[PDB]
Write a structure and sequence with these properties.
Strands 2-1-3 form a 3-stranded antiparallel beta sheet. It has helices at 9-20, 35-45, 85-88, 94-103; strands spanning 29-34, 89-92, 114-116. It is 31% helix and 11% strand. The protein is globular. The chain is α+β, with helices and mostly antiparallel strands. It comes from Homo sapiens (Human). The modification N-acetylalanine is found at residue 2. Belongs to the peptidase C19 family. Residues 7-118 form the DUSP domain.
């Protein structure tokens, strides 16, 4: 078990994997993550099963979660139009986001983008 603070990587990827399979609850509040940070994270953490060459690597260390690519031109509180799920962004449950923010926090100048569960 590594990391005195935060979770072990073996733990990180797997615990969050648990959050993706986790129920969303109609009327709940999820939080967006840019897919790129998370995809970077997958490498680093060994989330993606073929891609554990970067596992534990510092090269692939995803620092603070950066939703700037999701955020509109001018407003950090405004999401862009073409945004879709893991294709563009991702959502985490409260915990999921909390984890990621507990481990690597959120970028400076940003706020969590909370997305209610879809009405579809």
């Amino acid at each position: 078990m590594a990391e005195g603070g935060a979770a072990d990587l073996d733990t990180q990827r797997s615990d969050i994997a648990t959050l993706l399979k986790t129920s969303l609850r109609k009327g709940d509040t999820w939080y967006l993550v840019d897919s790129r940070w998370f995809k970077q994270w997958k490498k680093y953490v060994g989330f993606d099963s073929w891609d554990k060459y970067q596992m534990g690597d510092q090269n692939v260390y995803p620092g603070p979660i950066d939703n700037s690519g999701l955020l509109k031109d001018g407003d950090a509180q405004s999401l862009k139009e073409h945004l879709i799920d893991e294709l563009d962004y991702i959502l985490l449950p409260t915990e999921g986001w909390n984890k990621l923010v507990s481990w690597y926090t959120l970028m400076e100048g940003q706020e969590p983008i909370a997305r209610k569960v879809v009405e579809q």
